[PDB]
Design an enzyme around this catalytic site. Structure first.
Site, PDB file in Angstrom:
ATOM      1  N   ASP A  25     -11.072 -34.115  11.410  1.00 51.49           N
ATOM      2  CA  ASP A  25     -11.143 -35.380  12.136  1.00 51.49           C
ATOM      3  C   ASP A  25     -10.659 -36.564  11.321  1.00 51.49           C
ATOM      4  OD1 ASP A  25     -11.921 -37.523  13.637  1.00 51.49           O
ATOM      5  OD2 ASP A  25     -13.897 -36.721  14.133  1.00 51.49           O
ATOM      6  N   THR A  26      -9.407 -36.990  11.565  1.00 49.44           N
ATOM      7  CA  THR A  26      -8.832 -38.104  10.809  1.00 49.44           C
ATOM      8  C   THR A  26      -9.469 -39.448  11.125  1.00 49.44           C
ATOM      9  OG1 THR A  26      -7.003 -38.353  12.385  1.00 49.44           O
ATOM     10  CG2 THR A  26      -6.638 -36.894  10.473  1.00 49.44           C
ATOM     11  N   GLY A  27     -10.155 -39.533  12.251  1.00 45.96           N
ATOM     12  CA  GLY A  27     -10.855 -40.750  12.641  1.00 45.96           C
ATOM     13  C   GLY A  27     -12.240 -40.865  12.043  1.00 45.96           C
TER      14      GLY A  27
HETATM   15  C1  LIG Z   1     -15.297 -34.338  19.377  1.00 42.79           C
HETATM   16  C2  LIG Z   1     -15.965 -35.583  18.846  1.00 42.79           C
HETATM   17  C3  LIG Z   1     -16.190 -35.329  17.385  1.00 42.79           C
HETATM   18  C4  LIG Z   1     -15.194 -36.872  19.093  1.00 42.79           C
HETATM   19  C5  LIG Z   1     -15.444 -37.282  20.530  1.00 42.79           C
HETATM   20  C6  LIG Z   1     -14.400 -38.185  21.113  1.00 42.79           C
HETATM   21  C7  LIG Z   1     -13.632 -37.696  22.153  1.00 42.79           C
HETATM   22  C8  LIG Z   1     -12.674 -38.499  22.728  1.00 42.79           C
HETATM   23  F1  LIG Z   1     -11.947 -38.008  23.736  1.00 42.79           F
HETATM   24  C9  LIG Z   1     -12.450 -39.794  22.318  1.00 42.79           C
HETATM   25  C10 LIG Z   1     -13.205 -40.305  21.288  1.00 42.79           C
HETATM   26  C11 LIG Z   1     -14.162 -39.490  20.717  1.00 42.79           C
HETATM   27  S1  LIG Z   1     -15.148 -40.206  19.426  1.00 42.79           S
HETATM   28  O1  LIG Z   1     -14.596 -41.502  19.110  1.00 42.79           O
HETATM   29  O2  LIG Z   1     -16.534 -40.109  19.845  1.00 42.79           O
HETATM   30  N1  LIG Z   1     -14.973 -39.172  18.121  1.00 42.79           N
HETATM   31  C12 LIG Z   1     -13.761 -39.279  17.306  1.00 42.79           C
HETATM   32  C13 LIG Z   1     -14.107 -39.689  15.888  1.00 42.79           C
HETATM   33  O3  LIG Z   1     -12.962 -39.532  15.062  1.00 42.79           O
HETATM   34  C14 LIG Z   1     -14.755 -41.070  15.683  1.00 42.79           C
HETATM   35  C15 LIG Z   1     -13.837 -42.272  15.907  1.00 42.79           C
HETATM   36  C16 LIG Z   1     -14.585 -43.548  15.705  1.00 42.79           C
HETATM   37  C17 LIG Z   1     -14.438 -44.270  14.533  1.00 42.79           C
HETATM   38  C18 LIG Z   1     -15.179 -45.418  14.349  1.00 42.79           C
HETATM   39  C19 LIG Z   1     -16.038 -45.849  15.333  1.00 42.79           C
HETATM   40  C20 LIG Z   1     -16.166 -45.148  16.513  1.00 42.79           C
HETATM   41  C21 LIG Z   1     -15.435 -43.994  16.700  1.00 42.79           C
HETATM   42  N2  LIG Z   1     -15.372 -41.119  14.363  1.00 42.79           N
HETATM   43  C22 LIG Z   1     -16.671 -40.698  14.160  1.00 42.79           C
HETATM   44  O4  LIG Z   1     -17.352 -40.197  15.039  1.00 42.79           O
HETATM   45  N3  LIG Z   1     -17.097 -40.835  12.848  1.00 42.79           N
HETATM   46  C23 LIG Z   1     -18.350 -40.346  12.323  1.00 42.79           C
HETATM   47  C24 LIG Z   1     -18.305 -40.565  10.821  1.00 42.79           C
HETATM   48  C25 LIG Z   1     -19.540 -41.072  12.923  1.00 42.79           C
HETATM   49  C26 LIG Z   1     -18.503 -38.860  12.565  1.00 42.79           C
HETATM   50  C27 LIG Z   1     -15.731 -37.914  18.121  1.00 42.79           C
END
Ligand SMILES: CC(C)[C@H]1Cc2cc(F)ccc2S(=O)(=O)N(C[C@@H](O)[C@H](Cc2ccccc2)NC(=O)NC(C)(C)C)C1
Ligand SMILES: [Cl-]
Ligand SMILES: [Cl-]
Ligand SMILES: [Cl-]
Lengths: 99, 99
Positions: A25-27
């Site tokens: 997960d690059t995000g």
């Molecule tokens: C399949 C699931 C994993 C994903 C579920 C998901 C599914 C989507 F179609 C769109 C967005 C997301 S998300 O944003 O909830 N996320 C992507 C992550 O990369 C987020 C992005 C992000 C970054 C900053 C603020 C809000 C969202 N990071 C993320 O969750 N980071 C931590 C460290 C909390 C894990 C989790």
């Protein structure tokens, strides 16, 4: 390897003597794993994602193996819906985004 | 380009003639942008992440440029903490993970 993005980029990881499936997960700034035991000291932390924050336990200097690549770093443990490999460990395996 | 992950993979996007900053996110199945106006009808969708869910507006067939690469596809609009480019558009620009 080259991993396409037609489906979720899930890989097998080895952590704390267990095998788990996790998302590259690059995000994600941090690596976050579902509830499990890890050795050593930990401290509490709050991390924010799309739906708000969760409380996790922060363990430092944890060895993980991802696709035969060994790395060490901080691992957060808590109520994540999916196990996530974040940038702190993706950099260590030399993972890049290419287009 | 080849993007390393020592910092967040933030890029400039263009949508509705406006430049915005967004995160290239392999962990996101879908693209989600902060509140803005988009043309046409929208459909309801829920996105589950860490911390819970957000309700979003789904707009289809939206013109969006990512780091100069033109894409046309689904954009979700809602109360996300950051603009996220998910796999639906990362595949359109030919993005892969490599290590
Ligand atoms: C399949 C699931 C994993 C994903 C579920 C998901 C599914 C989507 F179609 C769109 C967005 C997301 S998300 O944003 O909830 N996320 C992507 C992550 O990369 C987020 C992005 C992000 C970054 C900053 C603020 C809000 C969202 N990071 C993320 O969750 N980071 C931590 C460290 C909390 C894990 C989790
Ligand atoms: Cl680390
Ligand atoms: Cl490097
Ligand atoms: Cl799409």
């Amino acid at each position: 390897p080259q991993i396409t993005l037609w489906k979720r980029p899930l890989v097998t990881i080895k952590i704390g003597g267990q095998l788990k499936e996790a998302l590259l997960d690059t995000g994600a700034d941090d690596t976050v794993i579902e509830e499990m035991s890890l050795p050593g000291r930990w401290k509490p932390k709050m991390i924010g994602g799309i739906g708000g924050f969760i409380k996790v336990r922060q363990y430092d200097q944890i060895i993980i193996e991802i696709c035969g690549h060994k790395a060490i770093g901080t691992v957060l443990v808590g109520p994540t819906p999916v196990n996530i490999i974040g940038r702190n460990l993706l950099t260590q395996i030399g993972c890049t985004l290419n287009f």
